[PDB]
Write a protein that binds this ligand. Structure first.
Ligand SMILES: CO[C@H]1[C@H](O)[C@@H](O)[C@@H](O[C@H]2[C@H](O[C@@H]3CO[C@@H](O)[C@H](O)[C@H]3O)OC[C@@H](O)[C@@H]2O)O[C@@H]1C(=O)O
Length: 452
């Protein structure tokens, strides 16, 4: 009588903080160059819960560079004060590489409440190599002594000031990172920390945040390693400072998020993309690296197998013809073109809202991959990734709690080769939703308590 998926609300796993992306390295500046119509279409496809992906997290870069040449993110303190005991020279431009505008829109127009500010590097004058690019380490960490002096507290004060500048512009930074890919030396903003050096810095940053006049004390994150395997390798050294930070972060480049890390903290997958793959907007062709289907399955893997509480693609909107970004902007034409990778992330984010709890679901046939989430508002979202033909599915709840009320209505949306989070029939009868899950799709079925 169709396949029945039964949600067990009494078996719970990780909280979901949400889904998102970045506009770092002046990708936000590229959005700002669009006509007003195009700016709003780019902001809608990213953040709109009615006509967009409903992304619920924005990752901002804490600019390290002396200026905005090339795609560099200028620092709030680009000029050296000479000694780390001298006051830092802040030169706040009220733009932050156009990330403040994107943030203000995300928060005030679209209701986003999670903002993750992550430094790729300290300013060059705070580092062993005197540059924010080409690796090097923060002056004054163990094994990183500098003629210029110990810049560790100055770096903590600087990160705190950046958060303060966002606060005074009506945006709360909720999460704060001080490194990115700390195993990697690159030709752009980059900075090398060992796990011990990360733990040493957290000892200094934590009391700096805790003692500050910040209205909201942001959660310290570590360490945006390039994969699960590399980040897992840092957790031993980090365990001595588990009382001093509250978020573990890693990318999906050098390994996949396929296992639960041994950490007490929530874990986010903060960066993945097909960075160099030829642009495609396709949902499904053959399961290649850029296809919407592939990315819908990557998010599934990170949440169900990696115990991720969040999933961020690298870039939202950007110019150029690789899959590093979800949304193509043609600066000439003033056009915005979402790939089916944007719709893949949205097929999660629209229905699995911040503060959702992952809950057990059973009944899936071999062609179906399923997961279920109970939202803070009591709505229950059930993900079905269908690798087979169309599949008639029934969705129902069970609980061991008599406080859990039966749902009063259901709706369903699908993304596939012809649909972008398009509503499909959800035939509801006495607590059960019946849906025809399209061939080669990700479908989400949501059961709603009565608003009336
Ligand atoms: C087609 O060039 C693309 C690059 O090949 C690709 O790596 C990316 O380059 C960005 C760079 O992205 C980093 C990817 O590695 C991560 O560890 C790191 O966090 C990211 O920052 O970021 C710096 C920026 O200057 C490069 O452009 O995207 C390139 C693109 O043009 O899309």
């Amino acid at each position: 009588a169709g396949t029945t998926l039964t949600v067990d609300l009494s078996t719970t796993y990780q909280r979901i903080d949400g889904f998102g992306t970045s506009e770092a390295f002046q990708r936000a500046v590229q959005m700002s160059r669009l006509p007003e119509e195009g700016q709003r279409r780019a902001l809608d496809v990213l953040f709109s819960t009615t006509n967009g992906a409903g992304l619920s997290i924005l990752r901002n870069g804490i600019g390290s560079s002396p200026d905005m040449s090339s795609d560099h993110m200028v620092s709030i303190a680009p000029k050296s004060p000479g000694s780390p005991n001298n006051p830092l020279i802040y030169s706040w431009d009220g733009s932050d590489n156009k990330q403040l505008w994107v943030s203000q829109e995300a928060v005030h127009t679209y209701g986003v409440k999670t903002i993750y500010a992550d430094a790729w590097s300290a300013p060059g004058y705070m580092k062993t190599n005197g540059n924010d690019a080409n690796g090097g380490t923060l002056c004054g960490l163990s094994g990183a002594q500098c003629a210029s002096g110990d810049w560790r507290q100055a770096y903590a004060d600087y990160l705190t000031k950046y958060v303060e500048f966002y606060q005074e512009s009506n945006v709360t930074v909720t999460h704060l990172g001080f490194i990115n890919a700390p195993e990697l030396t690159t030709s752009y903003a980059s900075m090398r920390f060992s796990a011990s050096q990360a733990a040493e810095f957290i000892r200094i940053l934590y009391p700096t945040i805790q003692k500050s006049n910040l209205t909201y004390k942001p959660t310290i994150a570590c360490c945006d390693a390039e994969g699960w395997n590399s980040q897992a390798g840092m957790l031993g050294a980090l365990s001595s400072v588990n009382s001093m930070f509250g978020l573990v972060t890693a990318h999906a480049y050098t390994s996949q998020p396929g296992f639960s890390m041994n950490t007490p903290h929530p874990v986010w997958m903060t960066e993945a993309a097909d960075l160099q793959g030829a642009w495609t907007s396709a949902w499904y062709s053959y399961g290649g690296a850029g296809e919407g289907w592939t990315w819908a399955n990557n998010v599934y893997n990170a949440i169900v197998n990696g115990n991720a509480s969040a999933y961020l693609y690298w870039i939202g909107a950007q110019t150029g013809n690789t899959n590093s970004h979800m949304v193509h902007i043609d600066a000439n034409a003033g056009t915005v073109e979402p790939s089916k990778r944007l719709w893949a992330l949205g097929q999660w984010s629209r229905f699995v809202r911040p503060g959702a709890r992952r809950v057990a679901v059973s009944g899936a046939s071999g062609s179906l991959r399923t997961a279920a989430f109970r939202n803070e508002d009591g709505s229950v979202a059930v993900v079905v990734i269908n690798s087979g033909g169309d599949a008639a599915v029934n969705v129902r709840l069970a609980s061991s709690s008599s406080a859990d009320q039966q749902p009063a209505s259901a709706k369903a949306w699908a993304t596939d080769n012809s649909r972008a989070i398009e509503e499909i029939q959800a035939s509801f009868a006495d607590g059960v939703a019946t849906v025809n899950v399209p061939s080669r799709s990700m479908t989400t079925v949501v059961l709603y308590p009565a608003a009336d």
